[PDB]
Amino acid sequence: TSASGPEHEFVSKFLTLATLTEPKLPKSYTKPLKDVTNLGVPLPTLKYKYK
């Protein structure tokens, strides 16, 4: 189970580094939809049909 130790180490450390200060934009931040001016990028089509 702990064979994924390498990636666990990285996640652990990275999370600590990032959360050392309050992230600039807080979790509850929402850009007012009135101000939203573009979509970002099309995501790929899924191979699976929806039914």
Residues forming the site for other proteins (CB under 8 A): 1, 4, 7-8, 10-12, 14-20, 23-31, 33-34, 36-37, 39-41, 43, 45-46, 48, 50-51
Return phi, psi of residue 43, to 5°.
-90, 155
Rounded to a whole number of angstroms, the minimum distance from the CB of residue 20 to other proteins is 8
CA-to-CA separations, 38 to 10, 23, 34, 44, 47, in angstroms, rounded: 33, 24, 11, 18, 26
CB of 6 to other proteins, least distance (A): 10
Least distance CB 28 / other proteins (angstroms): 5
